[PDB]
Design a protein around this ligand. Structure first.
Ligand SMILES: Nc1ncnc2c1ncn2[C@@H]1O[C@H](CSCC[C@H](N)C(=O)O)[C@@H](O)[C@H]1O
Ligand SMILES: [Cl-]
Ligand SMILES: [Zn+2]
Length: 419
């Protein structure tokens, strides 16, 4: 039921090195009602391959986007970390490129519309595009105009006709979720004026490799992207990569700016620097990806044995957060409700549900606080700093966290960290 990849999404070649294969795995954002059995739970092959031409890393299969996104789960309350990062995105886009007030900003994958709201607060006109009908209706209700559609060449034309030429087109994380990136590039080209920019924020393949972030591999994430593969793609569609900012968010990301090849925006030197860096760090060599694969095997084994060793000693263990990536981690490690008695999560609709595959219960933070947990496995480790900042009481009582990457570790460490 999920379609197999043939040619490379970015460059069009067909020379794939196998990197890792996790077998059939259930969908990471498909949380389940508790039940006696889960025999009909859908599973899809989860494996990654590396294109030797441009070094896009890609999943072997594309799960149907209508199935994934047409009813996507959301939250109505964004954390201060998320709000701060959304404010920073605005600041970078507007200040780095001198976007005047009253300019038009189009966002692909605009979701609840919070990122657009931040652009409006900075004095911009906005429009969103997001296929999740449930989420789009919420955004529209709040006053953030949103087209309940997938981005395409045809939607691009409808936008230009009714809303004009955007000074900025933004895609936050969504770009790695789209199979037909060639169509996106074409719709963008049509939309862009001479000094318009297309900006995309995606997890950075360099960081993913170096920090062993294999839990970010899940079916929604079709692509795992470095600057090289984006240049290869945009070359073929009259677009030029003009600038890149590296960011610590989501385990290391890149915010990439793209313009018309013959437009006003000059290419900054950082672009070539990052491509040279990617070469230098071995992204074009088979050994690198074989090295990634064994790190994964090593971390997976070590993590499982740590949890089970602590359990055998009579320590109680739970998951902190129930993010999509947590479900890759737990499934790949083969952990069950005997290993983690629950996963706490602040997202209301998740509370009372059960995790895909492992079927571990999801409970509220307020339930979590009634329980004498000794260790929390930090599944939402990309928010480690914000989480640790508010878990003083737990830490003071001798509670500990297990961090899965770069290697498995225990917080707090045995000595003060100052080196
Ligand atoms: N081809 C496509 N065009 C536009 N939006 C898409 C899309 N595929 C998925 N999406 C939307 O993008 C989001 C998935 S990505 C989630 C990241 C989101 N931008 C955020 O930071 O909050 C969902 O809201 C989904 O409905
Ligand atoms: Cl994502
Ligand atoms: Zn390629």
């Amino acid at each position: 039921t999920a379609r197999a990849v043939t040619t490379c999404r970015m460059c069009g070649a067909q020379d794939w090195q196998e990197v890792v294969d996790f077998g059939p795995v259930p969908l990471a954002d498909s949380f389940l009602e508790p039940a006696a059995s889960y025999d009909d739970e859908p599973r899809y092959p989860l494996a990654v391959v590396s294109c030797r031409s441009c070094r896009l890393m890609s999943l072997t299969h594309v799960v149907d986007p209508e199935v994934l996104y047409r009813t996507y789960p959301y939250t109505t309350s964004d954390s201060e970390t998320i709000k701060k990062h959304m404010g920073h995105v605005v600041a970078v886009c507007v200040e780095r490129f001198g976007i005047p007030e009253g300019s038009f900003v189009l966002e692909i994958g605009s979701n609840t519309g919070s990122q657009l709201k931040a652009f409006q607060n900075a004095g911009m006109r906005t429009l969103g595009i997001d296929p999740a009908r449930n989420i789009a209706a919420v955004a529209n209700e709040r006053g953030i105009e949103t087209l309940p559609e997938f981005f395409s060449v045809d939607t691009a034309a409808l936008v230009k006709k009714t809303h004009g030429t955007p000074q900025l087109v933004l895609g936050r994380h969504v770009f790695a979720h789209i199979d037909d990136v060639s169509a996106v590039a074409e719709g963008v080209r049509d939309l862009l004026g001479p000094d318009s920019l297309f900006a995309i924020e995606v997890p950075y393949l360099v960081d993913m490799l170096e920090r062993n972030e294999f839990d970010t591999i899940y079916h929604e994430h079709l692509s795992y992207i470095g600057v090289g593969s984006l240049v290869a793609l945009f070359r073929r569609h009259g677009l030029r990569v003009v600038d890149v900012e590296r960011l610590a968010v989501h385990g290391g990301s890149i915010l990439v700016f793209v313009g018309l090849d013959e437009g006003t925006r000059a290419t900054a030197p950082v672009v070539e620097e990052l491509i040279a860096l990617e070469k230098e760090r071995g992204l074009y060599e088979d050994a690198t990806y074989e090295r990634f694969a064994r790190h994964v095997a090593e971390i997976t084994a070590e993590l499982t044995s740590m949890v089970r060793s602590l359990r055998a000693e009579g320590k109680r263990i739970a998951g902190y957060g129930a993010p999509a990536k947590g479900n890759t981690l737990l499934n790949v490690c083969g952990l069950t409700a005997d290993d983690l008695e629950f996963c706490c999560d602040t997202t209301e609709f998740k509370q009372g549900l059960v995790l895909p595959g492992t079927h571990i219960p999801v409970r509220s933070p307020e339930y979590a606080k009634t329980q004498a947990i000794d260790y929390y496995l930090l599944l939402a480790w990309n928010y480690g700093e914000e989480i640790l900042a508010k878990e003083g009481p737990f830490l003071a009582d001798g509670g500990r966290f297990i961090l899965p990457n770069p290697r498995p570790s225990i917080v707090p460490p045995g000595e003060h960290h100052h080196h």
